[PDB]
Design an enzyme around this catalytic site. Structure first.
Site, PDB file in Angstrom:
ATOM      1  N   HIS A   1       0.804  -1.222   0.000  1.00 44.32           N
ATOM      2  CA  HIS A   1       0.000   0.000   0.000  1.00 44.32           C
ATOM      3  C   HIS A   1       0.842   1.280   0.000  1.00 44.32           C
ATOM      4  O   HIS A   1       0.324   2.369  -0.252  1.00 44.32           O
ATOM      5  CB  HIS A   1      -0.921  -0.005   1.232  1.00 44.32           C
ATOM      6  CG  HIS A   1      -2.140   0.860   1.097  1.00 44.32           C
ATOM      7  ND1 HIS A   1      -2.219   1.913   0.209  1.00 44.32           N
ATOM      8  CD2 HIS A   1      -3.317   0.848   1.771  1.00 44.32           C
ATOM      9  CE1 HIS A   1      -3.390   2.512   0.342  1.00 44.32           C
ATOM     10  NE2 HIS A   1      -4.076   1.887   1.283  1.00 44.32           N
TER      11      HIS A   1
ATOM     12  N   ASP B   1     -22.202   5.799  -2.967  1.00 40.36           N
ATOM     13  CA  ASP B   1     -21.158   5.803  -1.941  1.00 40.36           C
ATOM     14  C   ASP B   1     -21.661   6.413  -0.644  1.00 40.36           C
ATOM     15  O   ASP B   1     -21.435   5.872   0.440  1.00 40.36           O
ATOM     16  CB  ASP B   1     -19.935   6.592  -2.400  1.00 40.36           C
ATOM     17  CG  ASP B   1     -18.812   6.542  -1.384  1.00 40.36           C
ATOM     18  OD1 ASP B   1     -18.238   5.450  -1.201  1.00 40.36           O
ATOM     19  OD2 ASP B   1     -18.516   7.585  -0.760  1.00 40.36           O
TER      20      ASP B   1
ATOM     21  N   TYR C   1     -13.340   6.467   8.967  1.00 35.86           N
ATOM     22  CA  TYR C   1     -12.393   6.994   7.999  1.00 35.86           C
ATOM     23  C   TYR C   1     -12.817   6.496   6.626  1.00 35.86           C
ATOM     24  O   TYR C   1     -12.949   5.296   6.418  1.00 35.86           O
ATOM     25  CB  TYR C   1     -10.974   6.467   8.288  1.00 35.86           C
ATOM     26  CG  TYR C   1      -9.918   6.866   7.258  1.00 35.86           C
ATOM     27  CD1 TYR C   1      -9.972   6.395   5.944  1.00 35.86           C
ATOM     28  CD2 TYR C   1      -8.869   7.724   7.603  1.00 35.86           C
ATOM     29  CE1 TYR C   1      -9.009   6.773   4.992  1.00 35.86           C
ATOM     30  CE2 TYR C   1      -7.899   8.106   6.659  1.00 35.86           C
ATOM     31  CZ  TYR C   1      -7.978   7.631   5.358  1.00 35.86           C
ATOM     32  OH  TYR C   1      -7.041   8.029   4.422  1.00 35.86           O
TER      33      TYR C   1
ATOM     34  N   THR D   1      -4.520  10.571  -1.285  1.00 42.42           N
ATOM     35  CA  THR D   1      -5.760  10.546  -0.519  1.00 42.42           C
ATOM     36  C   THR D   1      -5.926  11.651   0.511  1.00 42.42           C
ATOM     37  O   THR D   1      -4.995  12.397   0.822  1.00 42.42           O
ATOM     38  CB  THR D   1      -5.936   9.209   0.235  1.00 42.42           C
ATOM     39  OG1 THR D   1      -4.906   9.079   1.230  1.00 42.42           O
ATOM     40  CG2 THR D   1      -5.857   8.035  -0.732  1.00 42.42           C
TER      41      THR D   1
END
EC number: 2.3.1.137
Length: 591
Positions: free
Chosen positions: A317, A396, A418, A431
């Site tokens: 990641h 979403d 989060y 992000t």
């Protein structure tokens, strides 16, 4: 149009106004504080704004003046490279290859044949990238950053004693040479081979020869030294085990570098996860767990192959987020669909060099470390619970609020959440944090559990919650969020040896989630039929990820068994019930 032609045109990541960010922060702690705590935090924020914060903000603006993306390097180090916990299990994200929904259902004895095509398609994607033929992502007519795609191939992490590093060897044709070999791990062993021959990429039949060769050889032979298993260790231990491995033989480094520079790592597993369109949570579990002996957790992209012909991907990641994996996996999925999961070209298998095995030099210590590495990963992974199901006003936002209600109902309190917000409108933007547990969301949740609440009241409040979340997601994706902003202020201080501002020591700062304390770690993984997941951010927390199709919602949830309060399966059941009530509320309200 070329893949990276708009990069020099992308706007700089912005630095929000101090007042705006602090106001949003104050508003976000409300759901977790009483009168007194809030007044204390309010006073802390006001002072910060008037003094230290104002000065730190100015310095942040000064940093932004010299960097198209003031956050990039800091985020990489602070969120990933500096963290010492085992990253393979606790940070890497994984995702199943959605081919068992059609032409490649679970079936024994199809591992090598399907594997040959998987490599071929994956490799054709690399060719597209190298030639910059991959379409530029755009929002309307606005180009989005494509930099993360450079981290898909020939990229690997290297452990450090206190800070890891990312090695990105990828290059486009216009930039220079790019490694042309892939690395295969089988039965605790490693092999490599070039994907090119006489100028072109080798075909499935040719790829099937290399794989078949590797499989047969190792099948009836004892498991190798399994050096790979060391990549699943605590970062500092791995860093030291690596240095020791290198001391035993300078050549061992050359082998490590060969793995590091490979287009990607392909892993052959003997396990067979139950994978059907109905139930496939087991694929996620073996992807995050599996057999360490054949996984290279430091690889940005590690394609996994199971015995029952199932496939999955495990990615570091650190260098990029899940959307790159989603895109290649979807590209491959389209190829499989177009070809009905078959190779219909020449069956000719030219005479190409056999796969070369990478034989590391190890002693008794190294083997004990490897042994230790395997055990800790397996023991840790065994505590992972994964729940994956399909369910059949932005989708979403709908899902985020449904989750708020589900957690509220299941645990009896608002869950600080989060949600990932992409900031790709900006140069190298990655992000931002969206805090779904808003006052609006909580007011709505309460009305949903309030017997005296009317139908109109509930819909009205649900809509206000939707409006709030939409504005939140918009601002954040546009660089107007505040979480990264506050991190930047904190880092400005630390970098100059100045004290940590009182604002961050405030009990409400971490209670609202700051400092990686979100009980709900979430993100939308796209609309490309691929699902991804990571373990919870906190021991008593959940990981909740999902993707959206025109006719369904697919979800993946993680929780730790060692935590008796959490249950991934139960939470998924609860959110489905939540989707239902929300739908009925809109329909009955339709009237």
């Amino acid at each position: 149009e070329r893949t990276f032609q708009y990069q020099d045109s992308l706007p700089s990541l912005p630095v929000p106004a101090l007042e705006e960010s602090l106001k949003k922060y104050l508003e976000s702690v409300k759901p977790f504080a009483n009168e007194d705590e809030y007044k204390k935090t309010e006073e802390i924020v006001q002072k910060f704004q008037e003094g230290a914060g104002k000065r730190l903000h100015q310095k942040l603006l000064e940093r932004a003046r010299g960097k198209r993306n003031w956050l990039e390097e800091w985020w990489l180090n602070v969120a990933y490279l500096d963290v010492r916990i085992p990253s393979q299990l606790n940070v890497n994200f994984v995702g199943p290859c959605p081919h068992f929904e059609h032409y490649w259902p679970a079936r024994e004895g199809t591992q090598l044949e399907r594997g040959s095509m998987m490599l071929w398609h994956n490799l054709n994607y690399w060719q597209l990238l190298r030639r910059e033929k991959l379409p530029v992502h755009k929002s309307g007519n606005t180009p989005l950053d494509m930099n993360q795609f450079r981290m898909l191939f020939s990229t690997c992490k290297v452990p450090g004693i206190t800070r890891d590093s990312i090695m990105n060897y990828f290059k486009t044709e216009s930039e220079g040479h790019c490694p042309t070999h892939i690395a295969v791990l089988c039965r605790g062993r490693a092999f490599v081979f070039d994907v090119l021959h006489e100028g072109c990429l080798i075909t499935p039949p040719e790829l099937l020869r290399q794989l078949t060769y590797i499989h047969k050889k190792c099948s009836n032979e004892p498991v190798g030294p399994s050096i790979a298993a060391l990549t699943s260790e605590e970062r500092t231990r791995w860093a030291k085990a690596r240095e020791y491995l290198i001391s035993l033989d300078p050549e061992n480094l050359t082998l490590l570098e060969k793995i590091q520079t490979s287009l990607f790592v392909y892993s052959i597993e003997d396990s067979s996860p139950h994978a059907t369109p109905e139930e496939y949570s087991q694929v996620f579990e073996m992807l995050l767990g599996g057999d360490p002996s054949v996984r290279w957790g430091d690889k940005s992209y590690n394609l996994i192959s199971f015995a029952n012909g199932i496939f999955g991907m495990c990615c570091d990641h650190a260098p990029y987020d899940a959307m790159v994996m989603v895109n290649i996996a979807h590209y491959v999925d389209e190829r499989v669909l177009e070809t009905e999961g078959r190779w219909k070209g020449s069956e000719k298998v030219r005479d190409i060099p056999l796969p070369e095995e990478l034989v590391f030099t190890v002693d008794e210590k190294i083997l004990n470390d490897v042994s230790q590495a395997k055990a800790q990963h397996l023991k840790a992974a065994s505590d992972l619970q994964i729940a994956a199901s399909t369910f059949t006003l932005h989708p979403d936002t709908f899902i985020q609020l449904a989750l708020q209600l589900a957690y509220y109902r299941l645990h009896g309190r608002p869950g600080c959440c989060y949600e990932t917000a992409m900031t790709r409108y900006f140069y190298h933007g990655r992000t931002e944090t969206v805090r779904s547990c808003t006052v609006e969301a909580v007011r709505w949740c309460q009305s949903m559990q309030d017997p005296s609440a009317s139908l109109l009241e509930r819909q009205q409040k649900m809509l206000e919650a939707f409006a709030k979340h939409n504005k939140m997601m918009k601002d954040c994706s546009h660089g107007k969020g505040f979480d990264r902003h506050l991190l930047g202020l904190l880092l400005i201080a630390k970098e100059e040896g100045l004290p940590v501002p009182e604002l961050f020591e405030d009990p409400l700062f971490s209670r609202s989630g700051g400092g990686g304390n979100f009980v709900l770690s979430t993100s939308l993984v796209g609309y490309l039929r691929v699902q991804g997941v990571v373990v919870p951010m906190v021991h008593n927390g959940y990981g909740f990820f999902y993707h959206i199709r025109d006719d369904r919602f697919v979800v993946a949830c993680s929780s730790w068994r060692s935590c008796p309060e959490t249950d991934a399966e139960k939470l998924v059941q609860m959110i489905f019930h939540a989707f239902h009530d929300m739908i009925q509320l809109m329909n009955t309200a339709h009237l």
